[PDB]
Amino acid sequence: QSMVDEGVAREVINRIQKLRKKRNLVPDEITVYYRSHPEGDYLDTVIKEHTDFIFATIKAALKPYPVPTSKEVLIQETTQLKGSELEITLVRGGLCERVGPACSYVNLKVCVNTEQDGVLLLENPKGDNTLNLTGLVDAVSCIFGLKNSKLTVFNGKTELINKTDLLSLSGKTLHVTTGSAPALSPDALLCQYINLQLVNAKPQECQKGTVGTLLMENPVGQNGLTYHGLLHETAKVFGLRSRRLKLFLDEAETQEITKDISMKNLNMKTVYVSVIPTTA
Amino acid sequence: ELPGAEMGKVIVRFPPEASGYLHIGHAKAALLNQHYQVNFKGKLIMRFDDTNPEKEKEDFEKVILEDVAMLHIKPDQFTYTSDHFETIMKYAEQLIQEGKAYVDDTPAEQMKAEREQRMESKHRNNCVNKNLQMWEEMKKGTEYGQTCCLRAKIDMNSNNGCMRDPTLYRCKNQPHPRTGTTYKVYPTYDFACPIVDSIEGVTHALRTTEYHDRDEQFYWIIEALGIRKPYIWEYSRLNLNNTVLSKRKLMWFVNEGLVDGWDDPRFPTVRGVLRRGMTVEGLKQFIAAQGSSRSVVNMEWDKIWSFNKKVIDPVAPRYTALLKDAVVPVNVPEAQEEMKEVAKHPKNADVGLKPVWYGSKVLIEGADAETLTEGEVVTFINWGNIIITKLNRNSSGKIVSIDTKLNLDNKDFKKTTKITWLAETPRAPLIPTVCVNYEHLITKPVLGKDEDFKQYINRNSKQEELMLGDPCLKDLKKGDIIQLQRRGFFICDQPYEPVSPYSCKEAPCILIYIPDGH
């Protein structure tokens, strides 16, 4: 009967590519979302077990519902198959693989006057503008709103020195206090973040790297990055403030990040940065 | 100056096409027009030449109004060629009805052949009625009218190509941006321009000397119609060395990515040229100094920059930037951290004062460091005389450190080396700054005819250098023109930005080098 279920899986497969032919789409990075309404019933079982097979012959990915609020629906069909109702939606571009921060960072617990959490990128773009302990203190002072008031940085229980190589502590959590080592170091970044990959052009302002990272908040819960801010900050990272930029969710450059994106959607995704000529 | 010109009664027009960006050539025409408008208390018409519903767009119209605004040109009236479509059509029908214009269906390539060989087309001698019938087909936009054009009946034998029955009107079923579909028939520039200059009252039509052939044509149309005859004043086209002005050539740089876009400081657009640090007044004085000259010289860019240098020198504040990579720390142990105010300008007390910070930890240029000797009295600019005591070097012989003794009671400044410097103090942190230098895009100054600019592309026309800037640079805004002492004039392209919460870094002050005339 596995050849019976494979023949039903082939009927879903055939259903999908007929939809590809409806939108004049020619193998075009796309994604296929599906819902077999009588949940867990026959047709939903078939499609899940055979998802590798379906993926192999329809060279696009195969995820279930719901479609992301961000993606533009190419088509949406509902038909019937072996006593289930079967919704197919095709959407532009491939998927959105979440990745770790590209630049060396440091989680920050700042106990002066309450506890504040945040992150400090130690370089931006990757390979440039690497941070000093003195640079770190200044950056902590601006972002967190502190004066250089006996500001002491503790790696765990050691106190750091103008010689400590900050980059070698890239995953760690540091403590900013007023001169008194703490007690009591998370793993995940305490702040939402995005990675940036420059694709079209090379960084300016003597910057050098083509990959960067933007926190979306600092300290945690403060200073929510806006869409227009993302455009400006992207430009600042690579030294492209004069240039007109387009941000894309794929490297194919088909899911363009738009002013009505939801910023939380972007978290941990790599944003692709494209420089276009300034025309009118 | 202008023949036939009276005070208060001069009327000039600047009639760009909204096919793209204004460049320095358009800048000259607009400023020459404004010059005659201001000096004669006359009127300046800013006329969009929208005869063609296919070469213009609403997109460049707005661009062009911004460029004109950036040149501080205030037209008294804004018109469009399309505003007179009705009247222009009527003058065409007048000429048809007088045997002065006929309609030709001869295909264009043959038509240019016959025009090339002083050969009259089959239609030149059509009676008025046959011309009026074909003209009706163009007006209605029929497929036969679409292959017809209205030509003036002048002289197929003239040495002046422009007199060999030029096209006055074409049939295009195109809808027009401002007139929509009222008209399926559209006049050529050659025909519209004399008429609209006459209607709008233009007393002096400024054209580049390259239009000289069309002046004869221009005046024929005026006389053939029997209307107000504007006076044509011809000035020389701007020929700048190392520079191309054609949209199709400029576009290649944009498309090849050799340039940022149309406002790139290497482009001769008015946008790019102002971004480079040209001032309007510097431009205005250059145009006025050569005025209405008809000799088409090969102008050197340096001659414009020297006019600009005279405008910015008296008013540009002086600040300091040190080349970050080569900077040498200097110990001034006696000095205490303090701040004094000092003139921003070396000769114009109007510019005001800047704060200077002093202290025991100071930085100087490596290039200057390597020229110092021990026991030398050196003037630190805005500070005073300082004695070099020890030059500390490393195992390779590189100065890595300099020790000094204050010598401030020594007020002798005749033969001392005068160096720039910046104090390292948390009370006035140094501002990260980038200095940008641009070169010409074409390495050959004058291209002969039949020579292709693409063989002389300068592929290294931008250079950036990382600097430690004067603390006062943090407040510069885009457009501020300043002088980096001992380096030159610069314009702020992007201001400094403090540490970002999102990128955890500052943005540097971006200064573009302003060529001075050398």
Author numbering:
A (entry chain B): 980 to 1006, 1008 to 1093, 1095 to 1165, 1168 to 1263
B (entry chain A): 189 to 706
Text from the published report:
Aminoacyl-tRNA synthetases (ARSs) catalyze the ligation of each amino acid to the 3’ hydroxyl group of the cognate tRNA and thereby establish the genetic code for protein synthesis. ARSs assemble into a multi-synthetase complex (MSC), which is comprised of nine ARSs (arginyl- (RARS1), aspartyl- (DARS1), glutaminyl- (QARS1), glutamyl-proryl- (EPRS1), isoleucyl- (IARS1), leucyl- (LARS1), lysyl- (KARS1), and methionyl-tRNA synthetase 1 (MARS1)) and three auxiliary proteins (ARS-interacting multifunctional proteins, AIMP1 (p43), AIMP2 (p38), and AIMP3 (p18)) in vertebrates. IARS1 is one of the least characterized ARSs in the MSC. It is a class 1a ARS and has an UNE-I domain at its C-terminal end that is formed by tandem ~90 residue repeats. The overall structure of GgEARS1 consists of an N-terminal catalytic domain (acceptor end-binding and dinucleotide-binding domains) and C-terminal anticodon-binding domain (proximal β-barrel (Pβ) and distal β-barrel (Dβ) domains).
